[PDB]
């Protein structure tokens, strides 16, 4: 029996910051700020990956698998996992984009972990990355909700019982029409109340299943890394699960909802701020357009500090965030 | 130890046919009058009936495409909604034409390492959306996988990507942001698929003589011939339907597999070699050990909405 330990983590938040005050200028949550990228999604992903690689101390030749969870890719042909691969010079790895909306990163984590357990993948890079700013209708509720950013992890095969344990991922397809941008693709819809109910239900039931199969009580959960879409969803999810609200890591106020990137960014910050201790039990939970949903139980291993650090950074930004949206 | 048997197969080729005419290996392609999700849906319905599984038994839906109707939400969730499958994991995977093989690999390992008992893996494309040209068509192919103890379905696979070839095959300004270098695409494809096939064969302990059938990506007849010649595999073992449908990217393999079974090209316990490549440049190969059954348990009446248009008409 093999496991996929999370041995590296990293993030990339673009520098141009957009305050609510900045928003008041042109405009008539929990969120105070978001970032707005002056580069493509593949660039955000690349830098976050560089941080996780250095954090893990792995050589780029050791990576067998790159998954980019996104719903805002630079291009469809080719995918952007292959762009990240080209940028980092990783040779020969499997490389794909996965689209499960905000639950993408959890889907990716589940997928890479099972690939590693059943076959010959020794290290993996799983990245959540978005440039939601590309989508926004500056007239329309939606505009204040979303930001740009990337988060990444590196997974390394091991015999120790760590990394993702059980996961339960799914999709409530009867809710598909309540959250959509239907004419971008080869072809907004936003019903807040229904999104709310189905999200808490989907994430809730998924979390419960994971906990029950792991034999854990809510009390043995040390940290909750939820999708950062809405503070009230997070509070409600915990309240209904009976999980103390202090265990939930929240950074939505800083970055807004960055779809697939929220969980890996939160996870990276939680580690940097020492919120996660060696051998802690984490509960991850997320949902997204689809309506996709998921939860996972991660057992952390020995190390919560980077082996090294990267000098990787985005090209210098000559623009303000107000400037980027003009 | 668990395995993912291919217990259902099915396809959906849109009716409007486009012959070679004035206005590869290829004589015809199909041109869809519906979205990609619709092609995927019908192919799925055929596979479900072929497998005799109930829609409530499906735990996982993967749609390999690079021409989805929408990015938000994904189209796996649309297929799920159309078939009424409750609660399954549903995602879109983009690895260009190697998508279906990537999906097959992913679903198989999900099923072996965790609690997914049945899966639907679909390749589906509407490449006609992209064209500015005689090389591509539209279509979908699907399989259903069912967990079992018998040593059948995908055995070893080797998937990868040659990222130094990323720029030789691209539509770079569709997305949130044509390039086509035929000779380089040719060289890297044969190299990528070749090396992948070799690694799979070697790990499986097979000689090329024990391969019964080859289901390759249908992008170009000469690529297929060259891949076999260099592997030492007899060219007669390679199933080819490109002449009928053209290159339907992620859909080529599952359509070919489905037709190979319908035409009795595949026998119980046959060893299949799948191989594919795509923009990325992605590449992959897989060894499938077929089980007992090569006939559908049932048939579906599922069909696309009636087409009132000619294919010439559809491109206008």
């Amino acid at each position: 029996q093999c496991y996929a330990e999370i041995t590296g983590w990293g993030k990339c938040l673009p520098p141009a910051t957009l305050s609510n005050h900045d928003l008041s200028t042109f405009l008539d949550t929990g969120i105070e700020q978001r970032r707005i990228s002056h580069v493509n999604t593949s660039d955000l992903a690349t830098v976050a990956a560089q941080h996780a690689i250095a954090c893990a101390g792995v050589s780029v030749e050791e990576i067998d698998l790159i998954i980019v969870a996104t719903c805002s890719p630079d291009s469809l042909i080719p995918n952007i996992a292959s762009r990240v691969q080209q940028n980092l010079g990783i040779p020969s790895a499997a490389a794909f984009d996965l689209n499960a909306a905000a639950t993408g990163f959890l889907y990716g984590l589940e997928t890479a972990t099972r690939l590693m357990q059943a076959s010959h993948y020794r290290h993996a890079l799983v990245i959540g990355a978005e440039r939601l700013s590309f989508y926004l209708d500056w007239t329309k509720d939606t505009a204040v909700l979303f930001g740009d950013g990337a988060g990444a992890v590196v997974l390394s095969k091991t015999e120790q019982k760590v990394g993702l344990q059980d996961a339960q991922i799914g999709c409530d397809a009867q809710g598909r029409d309540i959250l959509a941008v239907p004419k971008f693709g080869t072809a907004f819809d936003f019903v807040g109340k229904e999104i709310f109910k189905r999200a808490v239900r989907g994430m809730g039931a998924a979390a419960q299943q994971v906990l029950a199969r792991s034999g854990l009580s809510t009390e043995e959960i040390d940290v909750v890394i939820p999708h950062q879409a809405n503070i009230r969803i997070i509070q409600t999810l915990c309240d209904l699960a009976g999980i103390a609200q202090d265990k939930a890591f929240v950074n939505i106020h800083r970055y807004g909802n960055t779809s697939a990137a929220t969980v890996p960014i939160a996870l990276c910050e939680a580690l940097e701020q020492g919120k996660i201790k060696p051998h802690d039990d984490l509960l991850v939970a997320a949902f997204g357009a689809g309506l996709t949903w998921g939860a996972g139980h991660i057992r952390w291993g020995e190390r919560i500090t980077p082996l090294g650090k990267s000098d990787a950074q985005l090209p210098s930004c000559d623009h303000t965030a107000l400037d980027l949206l003009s």
Side-chain angles (χ1 to χ4, degrees), chain A residues 2-20 22 24 30-31 33-60 62-121 123-135 143 146-158 161-173 175-182 184-187 189-192 195-196 198-200 202-218 220-231 233-245 247-276 278-298 300-310 312 315 317 319 321 323:
Chain A
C2 280
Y3 296 90
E5 182 168 21
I6 300 178
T7 47
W9 45 94
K11 63 179 188 189
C12 181
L13 286 300
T17 308
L18 196 71
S19 43
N20 301 351
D22 281 352
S24 302
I31 302 161
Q33 314 190 308
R34 338 86 190 100
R35 307 308 183 79
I36 302 289
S37 185
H38 61 295
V39 296
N40 287 312
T41 310
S42 70
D43 291 302
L44 301 178
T46 300
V47 173
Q50 288 171 284
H51 293 296
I53 285 151
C55 176
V58 299
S59 173
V60 297
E62 297 172 277
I63 291 156
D64 298 310
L65 172 62
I66 301 167
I67 297 178
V68 174
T70 182
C71 59
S72 49
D74 315 14
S75 56
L76 282 296
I77 302 185
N79 69 22
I80 63 165
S82 65
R83 176 61 175 167
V84 174
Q85 186 184 355
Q86 181 178 52
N87 293 349
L88 308 172
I90 290 161
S92 80
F96 69 97
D97 299 1
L98 183 165
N99 179 13
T103 325
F105 171 81
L106 181 48
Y107 270 53
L109 181 61
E110 161 70 349
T111 296
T113 298
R114 305 327 168 179
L115 285 160
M116 294 173 60
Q117 292 171 313
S119 199
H120 42 67
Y121 300 85
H123 302 274
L125 197 40
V126 180
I127 304 167
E130 311 275 23
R131 195 181 147 241
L132 301 186
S133 50
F134 163 95
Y135 287 110
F146 301 111
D148 302 337
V153 299
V154 168
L155 308 186
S156 306
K157 181 177 293 200
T158 175
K161 179 187 256 294
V162 290
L164 186 68
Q165 303 301 300
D166 184 47
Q168 190 61 55
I169 47 169
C171 179
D172 173 15
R176 192 180 182 275
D177 301 319
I178 73 200
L179 180 46
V181 179
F184 185 74
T186 69
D189 291 339
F190 184 98
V191 184
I195 290 163
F196 189 98
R198 288 178 182 276
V200 176
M203 285 196 296
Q208 282 312 126
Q209 285 194 260
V210 164
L211 294 183
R213 265 184 308 232
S214 76
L216 293 168
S217 67
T218 62
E220 300 164 76
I221 300 300
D222 301 290
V223 178
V224 172
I225 307 299
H227 180 33
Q228 311 275 317
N230 182 270
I231 268 172
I233 290 177
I234 294 176
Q235 288 176 340
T236 305
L237 173 76
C238 291
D239 176 72
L240 295 187
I243 292 167
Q245 296 189 354
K247 290 167 173 190
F249 187 88
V250 177
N251 66 358
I252 194 184
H253 56 277
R254 291 172 86 167
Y255 311 129
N257 175 347
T258 56
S259 194
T262 58
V263 177
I265 296 170
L267 176 62
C268 180
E269 297 197 321
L271 289 153
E272 291 167 343
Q273 303 173 23
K275 298 312 207 306
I276 296 176
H279 316 103
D280 267 1
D281 291 295
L282 274 48
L283 174 71
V284 173
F287 75 97
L291 192 105
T292 57
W293 53 252
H297 169 221
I298 294 171
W300 205 264
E302 307 301 306
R303 183 166 57 79
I304 59 168
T305 55
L307 295 174
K309 276 149 165 186
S310 183
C317 193
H319 297 298
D323 234 356

